Design a protein around this nucleic acid. Sequence first.
DNA 1: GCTACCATCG
DNA 2: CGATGGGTAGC
Length: 259
Amino acid sequence: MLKIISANVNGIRSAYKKGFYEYIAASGTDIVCVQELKAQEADLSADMKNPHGMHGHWHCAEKRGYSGVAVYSKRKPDNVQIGMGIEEFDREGRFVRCDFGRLSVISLYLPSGSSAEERQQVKYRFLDAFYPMLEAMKNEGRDIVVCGNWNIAHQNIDLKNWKGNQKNSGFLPEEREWIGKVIHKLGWTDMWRTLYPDVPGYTWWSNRGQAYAKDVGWRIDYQMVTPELAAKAVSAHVYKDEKFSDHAPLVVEYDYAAE
DNA sequence: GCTACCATCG
DNA sequence: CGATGGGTAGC
Ligand SMILES: [Mn+2]
């Protein structure tokens, strides 16, 4: 049984403060994809690099206390790719790939364009140059999980107030259209949507108002899976027993064996 | 201090 | 629909 976790820690140090470290072991997971480390290698402790003896790898940004993704794994990954290859986005560190034989897990931090229009443009280009990547990986022949903060809502079911957010970044017709071109066109499987067609599955609630309390959140964290592995998925859930961050850890469980 | 990241109301 | 607001992490 292969348990994979995706979690935007929104600063890994705070998460470890709020008992995320302990949680990693408690969940008895085999792979953990974290987004937004908000730090650098020199900034992280040994436990934030190799939690509980679990191997680990990371991509950090040039900016201190900014962005950064990582992947922990009980098994020693055969190959590792830091950064997409596009320096423009690699200077922010949002892509980390780890091959574990037949399997390849990817931690992705899709840029959020809700801070400025220019950031929205950078996000758009990210999508444009990343689509071909999703396609190539779709045509490798290996089972590839993509855990990440896509920061894009697909349908009206993926967010509580889908009605008053069409003029807001994250639910813009363009972005949603891209996602569609990924699931149906590219042939990826929205693991959660495929396991639970009627469950909202919110994974993020804004600090504004009392949203988190009223379960007024979005679903911006995805695990896009290849058909072969997609079918092998047995369950999934959004862990909320403890709040480590404004995001909630997506825990998917597959009946897979990379060996 | 500066940077980055929409729910409730008028 | 449009006008009108917010608290986080980390340097
Ligand atoms: Mn964040």
